[PDB]
Amino acid sequence: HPEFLKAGKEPGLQIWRVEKFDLVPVPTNLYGDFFTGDAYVILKTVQLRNGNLQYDLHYWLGNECSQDESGAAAIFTVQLDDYLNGRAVQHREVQGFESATFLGYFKSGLKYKKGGVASGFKHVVPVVQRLFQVKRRRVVRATEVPVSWESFNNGDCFILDLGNNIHQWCGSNSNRYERLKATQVSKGIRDNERSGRARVHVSEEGTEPEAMLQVLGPKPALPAGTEDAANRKLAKLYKVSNGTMSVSLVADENPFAQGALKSEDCFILDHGKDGKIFVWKGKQANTEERKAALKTASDFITKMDYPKQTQVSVLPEGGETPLFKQFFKNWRDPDQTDGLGLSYLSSHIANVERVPFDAATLHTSTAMAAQHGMDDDGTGQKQIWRIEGSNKVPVDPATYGQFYGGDSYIILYNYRHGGRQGQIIYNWQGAQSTQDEVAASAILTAQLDEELGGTPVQSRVVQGKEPAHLMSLFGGKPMIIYKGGTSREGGQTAPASTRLFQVRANSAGATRAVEVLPKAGALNSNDAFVTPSAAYLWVGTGASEAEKTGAQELLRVLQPVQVAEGSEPDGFWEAAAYRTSPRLKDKKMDAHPPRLFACSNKIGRFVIEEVPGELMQEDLATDDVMLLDTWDQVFVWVGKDSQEEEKTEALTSAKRYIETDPANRDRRTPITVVKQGFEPPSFVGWFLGWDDDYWSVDPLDRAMAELA
């Protein structure tokens, strides 16, 4: 117990360096520097909504790390977790393969230095001659390399640190985004390592300053640089049983069952294909078992021949991360219904001010728009079309808000939010609409975007999973969705014998009534529901005010007999287990934090990489195409300079993204295409610190002269 009590009490970040079996704190102004030969320990403390403290324990192993040092650091992580009541999540991070949560801690990026305690090097603050290489993308990574032209190439950027003068050099085949990320590193050296007293000089090939050539000599010819699939839909779950390692498989299908987690045992979730494995500590497992949680997982990596660098995570029961919970069918946590937050608050959203919905103030806070999926109140001018054969036919204006599953509709809406305003194109593909009209609806949808100036937001929605914003476009009138039918002229035939509806309300108070099958299992305590005899207005336990008044407007167009749940008439159950667990609502954001991705459809292999940390507008590369994943929605940000193929692949990429998501995601999840510079409020609202004029001047040219 050296200086455990010095850290873990105030919310923040704390880093130590294992030096001869001892914890040595790293200078505050040096976090991000790590020696290839040493091992570090990191403690992330975030304020858990109400007033609690949540701990994330990472220990970091360099490449040139001695076996005695890795264990030394690995030992501390266990004893520290013990000192913090085992309620901390533990992480094994290896150089170059740090977890998404870990990378999010370092905005400026990481520096990998050559040296360590074994070679007698420290973290000094008060003459230098170093060379760094910054390659790849999104993840800033600067590795120290031999000081010679032998380390250079065209596709990457390099930094030559000389003390008073930092020289930045970018190859000819580099990109104007990578050069920007490298600027962050140079600022970190000029500001943090010199107390601001240094001249950062930049150059490109052929234009290298004199000081740079004097140490390297002449620049010869330099080469270029080089750098998957959807292999993360399936994962396996095992039970660990005891030196002699004994694992027993518990389930093979990725959509898991929460019940198989028994508190007396420990389990390992195998996602090694994607390079991650989890370790779950039950509350009733013996102490030696839970204290060997690290070395137990490491043996599993060996028994399966997974790469040594595979990420590891140890989760105590009741403190499961949102990534871990999504592997199970509808995670229902026991005593966490009321009260602020849930089991875990992702580090990149602990800073977001939770705003409740207030319709009177929506046209001011873009943050509220994003948090509730409402761009505005849904009262602007709206023009709807119905897909008849191979063109759009304007729908009966008095029937606005009625949609038949056998048709397909196109809705052009003009939303006014804040100062300016824009347009959103909604394509409603009915569940029973024929194959031709569905595809023709989406083609005419994309055409409508083209002839409108290529600016409005395209949003494809399937019958049954309509977004929250869509329900509130007809005033208080509820959106009604018939199962089968058609509003085509004279096409209406006759209704069915007896159908039953479910009236679900949103955060906005408006409601939608969707036709469903008349069976018992389709009953929901949270939602309201609506025979040749009469009509029953059944109100579930969770039924609120919106879906009761919505259920009378449904009755107004076609007489009521109100009846509450549990006490139903005798000839009423003339229609099994229904759903009783409630819906997430305000804390849905807690359980499913928003994540941002970059995607590419290169040579028959779809590849995505998650960008970590807090949502920063700067991470939206103009030539990339990004995925902003809410839970109810999947945004697609299309960079203006993206390839013409990926521009049109916007829909297909999101589809591929969802089909392969391990959560067995809802196949009808709405997908929303957004163009660069025309982001609706529900998209910009997630980026605290959004500058409209950010793209006005090129992002690379800004930071260029911004700091000399």
Beta 236-240 vs 199-204: how paired, if at all?
A: unpaired
DSSP code of 477? P
Q: Are 275 and 97 in contact (CB under 8 A)?
A: yes
β-pairing, 391-394 vs 382-388, is: antiparallel
> Which residue in the block uniquely carries the two structure tokens 């991705």?
597
- Collect all residues with Cβ–Cβ distance below 8 Å to 248 and sequence separation of at least 6: 238, 239, 241
Measured distance CA(69)–CA(77) in Å, rounded: 12
Q: Which two tokens stand for residue 247?
A: 């694992």
Cβ neighbours for 532, distance < 8 A, ≥ 6 positions apart = 497, 498
Contact 18, 76 (CB under 8 A): yes
Question: Which neighbouring-strand residues pair with 595?
Answer: 629
* φ, ψ of residue 68 in degrees (nearest 5): -65, -25
For residue 634, what are the CA distances in angstroms to 118, 317, 376, 481, 671?
49, 30, 19, 23, 5
User: In whole angstroms, what is the distance from residue 341 CA to residue 589 CA?
Assistant: 9
Which tokens sit at 144? Answer: 């120290």
Distances from the Cα of 215 to the Cαs of 160, 211, 212, in angstroms? Answer: 10, 7, 6
Task: Please enumerate in sequence order all residues whose Cβ is within 8 A of that of 173, keeping only pairs 6 or more positions apart, or say none.
Answer: 154, 155, 224, 225
DSSP 584-604: -GGGHHHHS--EEEEEEEETT
Q: How far apart are CA 306 and CA 562, in angstroms?
A: 60
- Decide if 40 contacts 13 (C-beta within 8 A): no
Q: Other CB atoms closer than 10 Å to residue 570's CB: what's the count?
A: 6
Q: What are phi and psi of 644, to 5 degrees?
A: -60, -30
Q: Do residues 206 and 215 touch, judged by C-beta distance below 8 A? A: no
Q: Among residues 322, 429, 277, which one has the least CA distance to residue 663? A: 322
Determine the straight-line distance between the first and last CA of the chain, rounded to whole angstroms: 47
Q: Residues 568, 538: contact at Cβ < 8 Å?
A: yes
How far is the C-alpha of 591 from the C-alpha of 662, rounded, in Å? 16
Beta pairing class for 408-416 and 382-388: antiparallel
Do residues 540 and 579 lie in contact, with contact meaning Cβ atoms separated by under 8 Å? Answer: no
Query: Strand 247-251 relative to strand 33-35: parallel, antiparallel, unpaired?
Result: unpaired
Cα–Cα distance measured from residue 292 to residue 91, given in angstroms and rounded to the nearest whole number:
14
Whole-angstrom distance, CA of residue 125 vs CA of residue 121: 12
Look up residue 141 and give its two tokens.
């990574």
Structure tokens at 541: 């336990």
Count Cα neighbours of 49 within 13 Å in the Cβ-side half-sphere.
14
Number of helices and strands in the chain (H, E): 15, 34
CB 238 within 8 A of CB 615: no
Which amino acid is located at 3 in the chain? E
Length of the chain in residues, anyone?
708
Count Cβ atoms below 10 Å from residue 458 Cβ, excluding itself.
22
- CA dist list (Å): 529 to 443, 445, 468, 515, 537: 35, 33, 18, 10, 6
Question: What DSSP string describes 515-582?
Answer: EE-SSSTT-BTTSEE---S---EEE-TT--SHHHHHHHHHHHH----EEESSS--TTTS-----B-S-
Q: What is the 3-state secondary structure (H, E, C) of 27-69?
A: CHHHCCEEECCCEEEEEEEEEECCCEEEEEEEEEECCCCCHHH
DSSP code of residue 167: E
Query: What's the half-sphere exposure (Cβ side, CA atoms, 13 Å) at 463?
Result: 23
Collapsed DSSP state (helix, strand, coil) of residue 465:
coil
Other CB atoms within 10 A of residue 268 CB: 25
CB 508 within 8 A of CB 479: no
- Residue 386 forms beta bridges with which residues? 393, 409
| 390 touches 440 (CB < 8 A) | yes
Maximum pairwise Cα distance, the chain:
96
CB-count exposure of residue 46 (10 Å: 0-12, 13-18, 19+) = buried
Q: How many CB atoms lie within 10 A of CB 698?
A: 12
**How far is it, in rounded angstroms, from Cα 566 to Cα 553?**
24
> Of 650, 648, 656, 655, whose CA–CA distance to 637 is shortest?
650
> Residue 440 to residues 409, 428, 437, 483: CA-CA distances in angstroms?
10, 12, 5, 20
Between CA 578 and CA 597 the distance in angstroms is 36
Burial of residue 432, with CB atoms counted within 10 A of its CB: 0-12 exposed, 13-18 middle, 19 or more buried: middle
* Technique used by the depositors: X-ray
Given a contact cutoff of 8 angstroms between Cβ atoms, the answer to whether 376 and 362 are in contact is yes
Query: How far apart are alpha carbons 13 and 40 in whole angstroms?
Result: 13
Residue 148, Cβ density class (10 Å: 0-12 exposed, 13-18 middle, ≥19 buried) = exposed
- Residue 142 gets the label, from left (phi > 0), alpha (psi -120 to 50) or beta, of beta
Name the residue among 1, 28, 35, 33 with its Cα closest to residue 12.
28
Structure tokens of 521?
Answer: 């299992």
Cited resolution, angstroms: 3.8
- Residue whose C-alpha is closest to residue 598's, from 624, 580, 579, 576: 624
Strand order in the sheet with 23-25: 23-25, 12-18, 39-48, 52-61, 89-94, 311-316, 276-281, 266-271, 236-240, 247-251
Closest CA to 619 of 110, 181, 182: 181
H-helix or E-strand containing 436? Answer: helix 435-451
* Distance of alpha carbon 629 from alpha carbon 639, whole angstroms: 16
Measure the CA–CA gap between 203 and 206, rounded to whole angstroms. Answer: 9
**Contact between 657 and 627 (Cβ < 8 Å):** yes
Return the SS3 of 444: helix
- Cα distance between residue 475 and residue 44, in whole Å: 47
Contacts 24+ apart (CB under 8 A), 284-287: none
Closest CA to 477 of 403, 536, 366: 403
Quote the crossing angle between the two packed helices 67-83 and 293-303, to the nearest 10°.
130
Angle at 542 between CA 537 and CA 545, to 5 degrees: 60
CA distance 107 to 513: 46
For residue 55, what are its two tokens? Answer: 């701990």
Tell me which DSSP letter residue 429 carries. E
Q: Which of 285, 280, 339 is nearest to 314 (CA)?
A: 280
DSSP summary character for residue 474: B
DSSP character at residue 328: B
Q: At what angle do helices 178-192 and 699-706 cross, to 10 degrees?
A: 20
Which residues, other chains included, contact 71 with Cβ-Cβ below 8 Å and sequence gap of 6+? none
Radius of gyration of the chain (CA): 29
As given in the structure block, the two tokens for residue 258 are 């929460």
What is the per-residue DSSP string for 411-425?
EEEEEE-SSSEEEEE
Q: Any bridge partners for residue 622, and if so which? A: none
What's the token pair of residue 685?
């609202």
The C-alpha atoms of residue 550 and residue 553 are separated, in whole angstroms, by: 5
Whose tokens are 């602020």? That residue is: 340
Q: HSE, CB side, 13 Å, CA atoms: give it for residue 687.
A: 17
The 165-170 sheet, strands edge to edge: 33-35, 110-113, 141-144, 130-134, 157-161, 165-170, 199-204
How many whole angstroms separate alpha carbon 111 and alpha carbon 389? 60
- CA atoms of 483 and 501, how far apart (whole Å): 10
Closest residue by Cα to residue 258 from 345, 343, 333: 333
| DSSP one-letter string for 298-324 | HHHHHHTT--TT-EEEEEETT---HHH
> What are the structural domains, with CATH classification, of the chain?
1-124 (3.40.20.10), 125-228 (no CATH), 229-345 (3.40.20.10), 346-494 (3.40.20.10), 495-582 (3.40.20.10), 583-708 (3.40.20.10)
Transcribe 638-686 into DSSP letters.
E-TTS-HHHHHTHHHHHHHHHHT-TTT--TT--EEEEETT---HHHHTT
Q: Residue holding tokens 């007896």? A: 498
Q: Give the Å distances, CA to CA, from 573 to 134, 517, 534.
A: 68, 14, 14
CA distance 666 to 664: 7
